[model samples]
Target chain A: TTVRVTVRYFAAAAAAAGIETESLEIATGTSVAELVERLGARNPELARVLKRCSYLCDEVAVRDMAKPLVTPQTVDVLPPFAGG
Target chain B: SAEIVRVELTEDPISLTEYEALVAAGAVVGFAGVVRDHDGGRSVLRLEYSAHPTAQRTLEEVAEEIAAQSDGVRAIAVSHRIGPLKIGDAALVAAVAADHRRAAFETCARLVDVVKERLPVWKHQHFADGTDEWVNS
Candidate 1:
């Protein structure tokens, strides 16, 4: 079964992507790299910025790209956040 | 005491402490959008805010939408001003109170976007060209 994921971002990210976030179904047991590749395929801007992102599963940091296939509990594709 | 949102408009500068006391907030996030002198390439002489008749209800709708989508969130308050505003003056203020910080942040961001898009609020861009243009009027 495919798992549906909802993506969200703000400010410059939203302005650039336009149309806010969307819900898409990823194949069951999709890898993070594969998911990122799929998302990048949909939005080229995301591909340009995805390299700068650090992986985090449920707010817990993940450094391994070789992690097993699984479902994303609450994956947050956060942008390079700044403060005022 | 659970307050999911708090919103208001004032001519005077707002107090963060007093605002925090107003709700049963866990991690209160307050963002003040000030009128800036620089806006990309345009030399903004001034700004004029306009609102749609259904704008008030639109704002309320944004609040409920955010409340339903989030966790550890109780209340939210959002207010925007309409009128001629000088530089450094506030154009809007949005506050959210949630049990966690992430939900508050995400919901607050969504709320702002909803207000900017769906609210019947319009604006007259008075540029340095001695000309002006109206948007979403």
Candidate 2:
């Protein structure tokens, strides 16, 4: 079965992607790394930035990119932090 | 041994006074991170900070971890401002309370460091020459 997940971009990642959010229909067992690979294939500029970005699955930090994503999850692409 | 008083990410200006009121201890150490006019010699006009939707949650987690690890810490309050900020504005405000000044100062410094390291926030700087760059991005 196919599942849909929302992908959100922030800061530099957003600039590179040229969009704030998007929806993707991936296979049930697709992992975050797999989705990222697909996204990289679609946008080279975003792919370049993604190399330095971090992923958050469902608002929790993704420590393992190979972990399969659950349906209805939102993935946030975060660039390096610069907070005080 | 320690407690998280308050942790937040806001679009409004950061207020140290508000953080100071959150803790009752013998020593209170406060820090204000201000937006500067220059960075690496470039004249910065302003800054716009962006945060992930989960940034607040991440900030709370960071604060909690620090509190759990630090000893003799009474309370800790920290806030980071998002959206547009002018030069001289406070971008971050933090207060740590402890039984002694040394503990307060040490924990407050470590708290600020960990928050900066782990928080999912970014700063876009607009320079006087019309070029903009994302800090640490």
Candidate 3:
């Protein structure tokens, strides 16, 4: 079985990607960075759209991309719309 | 039903029916704000709404305020918008549904009052008469 990941976008990202949400499944030991690389590889247009995405694993911030991967129950890749 | 209540920025005008329906909803109350062609006897051509960084927090806070005052409100929802707007557009809508009409109406009214008094979302009115100013100020 693969882990479930959710990608959310709004405004510009939503407009660019042409989709509001996405779901992807990956092998058990995927890191946040690895997830980004794989997702970019899968969708070239999405890769370009995610240039400004903020990564969160189980709601914990992945501050540094080079850190390491923690098995997240669910990963969320979203555009930066956090601030009001 | 507790539907979407919110404030938005656009070039259109708003209506009160949206709020009244929610308010008169036997179990829910609603409040909506829209742009008008004129305000204070002046012709308003359009408006631009903008909010500070604390804007989202303020929105949730306003919903919390309505919920606090109304005992029967089951749930509350609200949203706001930025950028530009024109005549006959929506600026915001805040509403609550409860077991009691009093709570519903009170909550609906309070949501608007508190948001305007507390939240940082405001409008810059572009008047048709060549004069423009901030509605909040």
Which candidate wins on lDDT? 2
Clashes (backbone N, CA, C under 3 Å), per candidate, total: 12, 0, 24
TM-score: model 1 vs. ground truth? 0.53
lDDT score, residue B117, model 3?
67
Error of 3 at B35 (Å): 0.6
Ordered by lDDT, highest first, the candidates read 2, 1, 3
Q: Which order, best to worst by TM-score? A: 2, 1, 3
User: Model 2 misses residue B126 by how many Å?
Assistant: 0.9
Summing lDDT over every window of 10 consecutive residues in candidate 3 chain A, give the lowest-scoring window: A75-84
TM-score of chain A of each: 0.66, 0.93, 0.62
> Model 1: residues >4 Å from true position, as ranges?
A1-84, B1-21
- lDDT (10s digit) by residue, model 1, range A13-83: 44335745666688787777776677678777667666555444554445775554456465445444221
All candidates: CA RMSD (Å) = 12.4, 2.0, 10.6
Q: Pick the candidate with the highest TM-score.
A: 2
lDDT of 1: 0.61
